[model samples]
Target: RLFANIIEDEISEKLIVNYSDESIEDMKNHKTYKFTKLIQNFSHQNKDLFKEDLHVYIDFCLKRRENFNLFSVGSSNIPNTFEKLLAFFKNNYFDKFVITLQYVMLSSQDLLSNKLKIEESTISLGSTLITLDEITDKLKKKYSNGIGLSKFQFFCLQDIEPIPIDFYFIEIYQPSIYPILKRSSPLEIVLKKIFHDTKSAFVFQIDHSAEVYDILKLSSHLSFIRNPK
Candidate 1:
């Protein structure tokens, strides 16, 4: 049986969910399923573009690689980090904000059935109550299985107002390459630009290089600016 936790059942506003326990047969019959599949296929197609275009950006960086060298930074105490981060949010009178926590992993073989625990903390902050689920609640469920990519999305909102799916493409993912290639910048700067324009923030804990170094460095900088010693 395909279980669906209907958040809102208004006319044509059927908000579905993500890599949850819904069967493929049932999903094919739903109205929003096609959009989900489209997004998935778009992600697949982007792999080709990343290989072709982002590789050009890499070549440019190779000329000035040492100037961007940043693999030496170490990890911080996560428990303490979260403590301070949350405290900062509370101090700023942001008691009811949203935080979308997403994880995208690529592998040769599929790994989708590994239990997804969505507890209160898994989807929100503990004390202040951050709604860690603005965009995630409506994502399609079958992201991994035979598919080559496993992508997760979270949309956090402060008020009752919800964001339209069409708006997301314009505000977030649409600027994947154009603005950077047009102006020549690293991935971190791209994220900084996006966050600044949206008046939002992010935290990442991944093990990659170059762009990873840039994002992690910015993460540290954000942490420092909020929590001074």
Candidate 2:
């Protein structure tokens, strides 16, 4: 009954506004709704006339159940909606991480704009020196159970392959990277090319940042990642 009401309401709200009065009358008296109800009421009503009708209703209910199951899985919104939210978070979190790197690089007094520095030589103490394996390990630990870190690493490696241990450090603090005068000038060009080839990374980082900010601000949520003392 609830399902029927929802369908009827959705149809009337969406379709009736455009329908002519005559069409409306015809729809009101239409056999489709009655036939649907008849199938629901008596699964085996008319043998030949409604042969596949019971199956149709059963299928409809099954689909509805699936949709309801999806909706019920989360606190609010549908499954697709939840997926979109997750996607948004995954994307922006990566972006913020990248942007943070950019900012950190820009802030460094030792690293010249034109040259990439070795990890051991870099002045920034907080940025960890990590290999590909170490990078993955840190991300898994920081992001809690791996989450979107793998995708971030994939995008980063693709953008700057043969990346030095130091470069990975820069990527995690992406925002900091952009402001340094030397890299900022070239980064504008390189980032443009990288983004053109793999737009997904761009989407991932931007959306991830926004989600993190919101959760922290609105929910007063503390992330699982360790903070620098």
Candidate 3:
């Protein structure tokens, strides 16, 4: 019933329960927790969804007798801040372990204009395409050896805006000996080309707004056997 209410956006953050120390311990062993990922993912677009996922996650922990503290923090105004606080509480108070949520504005105009550097990677999340030189320059120093086939790893955060497939392919994908682009691609011919050609890594970008039918179509188009099947 609560879950139904959550789905209908009828509940408040006050109805959400506490995060647990046992859960933190579980996270330490598991290394990665999916609910946090879900929370972070939903935090941007749907505040209610974020809260709902969070509430249910906490409820799951409590119902399992994981032992929880009544430490609740939330607001519809800024989910990011709430998430940060939750991370901080879990990290600082309970254990000395690192509990962090990275909030990168991959779609922000300001950040893109000034060049948001993800350490050894350059990002162009907007309509303006990134040049080959910039891509090469950014990742070149990270390369160990130049003799053999080197890999260029690309992660397209197609959250803010859909990447230009043609420009992306021309600039980033074609030149490299071994290229891996994740969470972006759809053009059938382009996908076919990449699938047949070079030692490559391919993954279709799953848009947040995409439907199940869209997924089925994508899967239908991109079904191909890779290594270790």
lDDT of 2: 0.22
Candidate 2's displacement at residue 2, Å, is 36
Per-residue accuracy of model 1 over 1-229 as CA lDDT, tens digit each: 0111111221122223333432122232343321111111121122121223223332243222211100111122111222232233334323333332223222122322232222322221121111333323343332211111112122224336633110001111111332332231333443333333322222222221223233323333443221111
Give the poorly placed runs of model 1, Cα more than 4 Å off.
Answer: 1-83, 90-95, 103-160, 163-196, 199-229
In the range 45-148, model 2's lDDT, one tens digit per residue, is 31221123323432342323211010000111111222232333344334422312221232232221222332322223333323222223223122110011
lDDT, candidate 1, equals 0.24
TM-score of each: 0.20, 0.19, 0.21
What TM-score would you give candidate 3 relative to the actual structure? 0.21
> CA lDDT of 145 in candidate 1?
14
lDDT of each: 0.24, 0.22, 0.24
Report how far residue 154 has shifted in candidate 1, in Å.
11
Q: Highest TM-score: give the candidate number.
A: 3
Error of 3 at 66 (Å): 46
In angstroms, give how far residue 225 of model 1 lies from its true place. Answer: 16
